RNA sequence: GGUGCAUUAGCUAGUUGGUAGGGUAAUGGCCUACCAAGGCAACGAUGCAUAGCCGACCUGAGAGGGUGAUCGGCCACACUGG
RNA sequence: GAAGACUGGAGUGCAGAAGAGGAGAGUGGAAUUCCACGUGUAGCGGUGAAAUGCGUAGAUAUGUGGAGGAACACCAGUGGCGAAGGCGACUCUCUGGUCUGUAACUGACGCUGAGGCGCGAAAGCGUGGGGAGCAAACAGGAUUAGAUACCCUGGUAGUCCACGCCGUAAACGAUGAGUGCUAAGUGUUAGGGGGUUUCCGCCCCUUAGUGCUGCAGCUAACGCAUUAAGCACUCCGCCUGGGGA
RNA sequence: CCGCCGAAGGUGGGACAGAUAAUUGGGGUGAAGUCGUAACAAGGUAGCCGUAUCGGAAGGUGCGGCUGGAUCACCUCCU
RNA sequence: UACCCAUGUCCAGGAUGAAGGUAAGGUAAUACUUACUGGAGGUCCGAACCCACGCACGUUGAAAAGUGCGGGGAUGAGGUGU
RNA sequence: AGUCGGGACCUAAGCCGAGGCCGAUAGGCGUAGGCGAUGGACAACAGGUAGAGAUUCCUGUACCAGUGCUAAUUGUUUAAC
RNA sequence: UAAGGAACUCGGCAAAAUGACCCCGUAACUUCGGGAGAAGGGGUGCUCUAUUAGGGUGCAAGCCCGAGAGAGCCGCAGUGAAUAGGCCCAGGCGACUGUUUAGCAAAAACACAGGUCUCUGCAAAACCGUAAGGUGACGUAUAGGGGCUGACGCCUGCCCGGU
RNA sequence: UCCUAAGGUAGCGAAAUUCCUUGUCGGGUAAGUUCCGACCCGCACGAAAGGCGCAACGAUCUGGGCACUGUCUCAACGAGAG
């Protein structure tokens, strides 16, 4: 659920956060844990590319199985778990050989049931199947664009994508951005919406808060001196004095589209969002 | 409550082998459904129409309790304690 | 047994009861020490406003409504507090 | 008040019946809109008359296919169900109440009910979705002495869904709930009994609803009249000239 | 002489009641002033009730409801 | 010196009493009330530590930015070493 | 100084980098591999020391790894270790 | 430092004043947590009853902890020294904690949690680099980049001719 | 009636915004160019360069009180370092 915090003092006034009744155990599986170090935003060069980045709490890579090609085998939930790194949970799944692995928990995946993945997979929520034996109207996650890739398209908490008709060689899917696509009919999925639906509702509460989660402060451009940002001088407060807003290198950020107009994937969208 | 389920706490708490209408008959009865409704409302949460014939229910069943209790206190003591009321 | 307000909902701490003593013409938290946490209230506590009470007087077919000067009974007061 | 006894009140049992009563999950067909592609040429749409608007960048019309949302044509009925608000496509799951017959069972276990607790059309409010038609606000065109309107072309919140608030209505039968008594005539809904008849059908009696007409009685009148606004008993709510309010 | 209790007095923060005050809000009264004509007839767009928004003003419009509507057509019940 | 990365370390004492839990009540079951428990916080007061708000002195200074007396934060968006 | 801190032990950030990819020259990036503590592992304690060192020298009692020499034991290619 | 007590001054700047522990009591307003150490008051020393009543420790010896009271005694003064909040009424700005011009400005400036617009279907957009190679991200529209506004409450009107 | 794309809505208003200006009236003071409350003829407010409010918070700015004082009337004496 939700759960309201009672307004102590003026930081906890306005937070909310989720209350974990989902999560099972909190120790992870230590045969699949991989380090991760932070970067910052600093590229290659050790320059900081990216900003707004830096400075949180630290973390440990969960290794998932995203390609979900262990087919025949009998997979049970063991428990559900918490991920730092991504916005879902995560289920620990041991098969019959003895083998485990996590993958995304779905929504209504519970301890105790049997996952399957192949083509004699029955369609229920947390199975994977390639997309021509996954009958129309089906919501799924997890889709992947190249067989034998792994999943990539529909993966963050809450969102689902929607299985739309046949072409063929081609499987019509209506991306949870409410884009029409056309992917290959060997690519895989998993059937079902994903876990973790409360997590667009909580309210943050602090600035520092924040900076738990590895946030450093944004500056507005009205703010800044005229060598910092096209919007940058006047004195008091100025409006956007141009013909447009501009981002700090130029190039109009409102309206203003940046998708490459003699793209190669443009003949395998149908309609845009 | 099916009407097979019924009959057997009829025949549970008679007074004697063949009455069906003893206050001790009619408040296990009554116990029965109201331990039925309660799972039905609990998950319906939105049925009101079906919420106010189990207030009638708890009203009618006190009634009975009430009377049991002046008319022969011994016999009301025994019921609450082997039906599990307070 | 005899008044208005709920657009006045809680009031009380010697307060409620007990044990020993003091004091009074006399019983009593009347007073004191100890012990316990009780007592009152929607059958209207508490608070605000108004008022001496009655026999009786005026009116009324009666039931009631209004009043309590003169006469008689009781009470309180005696420039204002102790 | 106490001790016993009874079954006409009340309730259980047994055998049947009807119903858009409620909540959840899934599915169906007409129709509107948008999109893509054939055919085709100059208007379409609209009004009391018009104009704004759409159309040669090829519309309206027409044939084929796709997407999506909302309401459920005929059945349909002073018909049905519910305490009221209200409930109309189909199937399943979970659930509430009512009517009829029987006389097995308990034996007054009942009625009303201030405070209290719940439900409660539409509009409106918060969070997340959805958005085809309709449409406050708004824009343009007409009408008019003027037209912040009626009329026309568009159109946002809203109407739809989940959860949580709000607590009002000409929420009306302008008629509180329970009980008993007091001419008839005639439709209709769900049952039961009897006579005719092989059935069907016709007739009579009876229980619970739902309409119309009318006697006594009541009413200021209109009118009500076994579903009383008649004759009676119990409990609750409310009123005491108008405005201010 | 000392001690308890103790009227009046002083200090403090609250409770309640009246009067007064620049200005301001709705209300009522005044035959003759200005603007329009919302209601009563189908009152010239039927009216009213709750709610939301808009407009000099009466008021307009949307959503749901009522007849305390003459109305315009096939059927149903009573005489 | 600014921001970042890896790995260590520091923060005397005292105050307040969130969620949850238990028991007793209260209900058809809940809501709700009262006690006990519990130990949250960019919470509170205040040293070490970090900072630099006022005044005075210094101004060929003890010092090319300090000292004295008061001042702000002090479990965190914290200080600091390699 | 076998025993304390560091090497002959280990790795983080980072750095270098055979082949390799890229680029007027110079060079940039990067795989195997390797360096790199501020972290991990690892065997010694108490006294004495009058000019200057002490878990180091001296006294007493220890521990860690290894080697040879003796004495029994066991095993020998269905095979101790 | 007598008497006065802000008459000084741009301005109560500086100084003076309050300060510990225990008990009583406490307003408007409120986002129901607060305001609050609101305000305003009272008590503290020593002796005797007294190794107290009662607790911690121990097998006992013993040791440690120490409330209420009564009676007294002494000073001008009893937290007798040092250390230890002054408070109230009303308005502007910023919601709050935080950050800032090393060396004249600590603020009403920046940040913030929240709001909204817009771009991006993954070899994502955006950014560094001639390229290779990277950050974004070992992420996947409930995610990532940019512009503006800045808790919360009530609201956010008209204009698409110009750019 | 002329012009325009359309002519500023709610709310606030001598304001961190008002030149004239110490606007006018009221309160506070013996006396108030600052302060608080009203008015609206807004030089030259106004809705995300957001509009109007708002408990808690502030080494923030502004006006008024109690206590207190060598800040002052108006200065005097004493200690230490020059
Ligand atoms: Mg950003
Ligand atoms: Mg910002
Ligand atoms: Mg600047
Ligand atoms: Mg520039
Ligand atoms: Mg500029
Ligand atoms: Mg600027
Ligand atoms: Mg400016
Ligand atoms: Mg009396
Ligand atoms: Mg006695
Ligand atoms: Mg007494
Ligand atoms: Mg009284
Ligand atoms: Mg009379
Ligand atoms: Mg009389
Ligand atoms: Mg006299
Ligand atoms: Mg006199
Ligand atoms: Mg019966
Ligand atoms: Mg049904
Ligand atoms: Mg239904
Ligand atoms: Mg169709
Ligand atoms: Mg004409
Ligand atoms: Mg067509
Ligand atoms: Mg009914
Ligand atoms: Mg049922
Ligand atoms: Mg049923
Ligand atoms: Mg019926
Ligand atoms: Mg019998
Ligand atoms: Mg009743
Ligand atoms: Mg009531
Ligand atoms: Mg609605
Ligand atoms: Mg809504
Ligand atoms: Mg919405
Ligand atoms: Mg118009
Ligand atoms: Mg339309
Ligand atoms: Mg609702
Ligand atoms: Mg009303
Ligand atoms: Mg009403
Ligand atoms: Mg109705
Ligand atoms: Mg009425
Ligand atoms: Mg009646
Ligand atoms: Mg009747
Ligand atoms: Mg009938
Ligand atoms: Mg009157
Ligand atoms: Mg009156
Ligand atoms: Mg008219
Ligand atoms: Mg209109
Ligand atoms: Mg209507
Ligand atoms: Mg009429
Ligand atoms: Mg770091
Ligand atoms: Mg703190
Ligand atoms: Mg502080
Ligand atoms: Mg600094
Ligand atoms: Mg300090
Ligand atoms: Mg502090
Ligand atoms: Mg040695
Ligand atoms: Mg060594
Ligand atoms: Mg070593
Ligand atoms: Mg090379
Ligand atoms: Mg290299
Ligand atoms: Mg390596
Ligand atoms: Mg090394
Ligand atoms: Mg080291
Ligand atoms: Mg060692
Ligand atoms: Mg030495
Ligand atoms: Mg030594
Ligand atoms: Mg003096
Ligand atoms: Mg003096
Ligand atoms: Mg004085
Ligand atoms: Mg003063
Ligand atoms: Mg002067
Ligand atoms: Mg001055
Ligand atoms: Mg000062
Ligand atoms: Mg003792
Ligand atoms: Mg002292
Ligand atoms: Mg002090
Ligand atoms: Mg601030
Ligand atoms: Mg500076
Ligand atoms: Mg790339
Ligand atoms: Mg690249
Ligand atoms: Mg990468
Ligand atoms: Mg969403
Ligand atoms: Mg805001
Ligand atoms: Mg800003
Ligand atoms: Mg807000
Ligand atoms: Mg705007
Ligand atoms: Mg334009
Ligand atoms: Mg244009
Ligand atoms: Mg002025
Ligand atoms: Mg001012
Ligand atoms: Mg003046
Ligand atoms: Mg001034
Ligand atoms: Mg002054
Ligand atoms: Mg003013
Ligand atoms: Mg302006
Ligand atoms: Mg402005
Ligand atoms: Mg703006
Ligand atoms: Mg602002
Ligand atoms: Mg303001
Ligand atoms: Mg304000
Ligand atoms: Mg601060
Ligand atoms: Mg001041
Ligand atoms: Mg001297
Ligand atoms: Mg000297």
């Not at chain 1, 995203?66 to 939930?77: A, L, T, W």
């Not at chain 1, 969102?159 to 060997?186: C, F, P």
Request: glycine share 10%; charged share 30%.
């Amino acid at each position: 659920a939700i759960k309201k915090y009672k307004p102590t003092t003026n930081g906890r006034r306005h937070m909310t956060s989720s209350d974990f009744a989902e999560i099972t155990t909190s120790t992870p599986e230590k045969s699949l844990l991989r380090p991760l170090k932070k970067k910052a935003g600093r590229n290659n060069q050790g320059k900081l590319t990216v900003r707004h980045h830096g400075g949180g709490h630290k973390r440990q890579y969960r290794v998932i199985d995203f390609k979900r090609n262990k087919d025949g085998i009998p997979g049970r939930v063991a428990t559900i778990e918490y991920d730092p790194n991504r916005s879902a949970n995560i289920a620990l799944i041991n098969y019959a050989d003895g083998e485990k692995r996590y993958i995304i928990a779905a929504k209504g995946l519970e301890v105790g049931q049997t996952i399957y993945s192949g083509a004699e997979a029955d369609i229920k929520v947390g199975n994977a199947l390639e997309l021509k034996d996954i009958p129309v109207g089906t919501v799924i996650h997890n889709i992947e664009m190249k067989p034998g890739k792994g999943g990539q398209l529909v993966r963050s908490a809450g969102t689902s994508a929607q299985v739309l008709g046949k072409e063929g060689k081609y499987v019509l899917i209506r991306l949870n951005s409410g884009e029409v696509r056309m992917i290959l009919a060997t690519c895989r999925a998993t059937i079902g919406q994903v876990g973790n639906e409360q997590h667009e509702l909580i309210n943050i509460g602090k600035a520092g808060r924040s900076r738990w989660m590895g946030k450093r402060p944004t500056v507005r451009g009205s703010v800044m001196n005229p060598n910092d940002h096209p919007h940058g001088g006047g004195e008091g407060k100025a409006p956007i004095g141009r013909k447009s807003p501009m981002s700090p290198w130029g190039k109009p950020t409102l309206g203003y589209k940046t998708r490459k107009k003699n793209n190669n994937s443009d003949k395998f969208i149908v309609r845009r969002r | 409550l099916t009407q097979e389920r019924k009959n057997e706490i009829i025949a549970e708490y008679r007074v004697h082998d063949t009455d069906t209408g003893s206050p001790e008959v009619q408040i296990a009865v009554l116990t029965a459904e109201i331990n039925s409704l309660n799972e039905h409302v609990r998950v319906h949460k939105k049925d009101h129409h079906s919420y106010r014939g189990l207030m009638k229910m708890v009203g009618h069943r006190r009634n009975l309790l009430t009377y049991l209790r002046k008319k022969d206190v011994q016999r009301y003591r025994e019921l609450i304690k082997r039906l599990g009321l307070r």
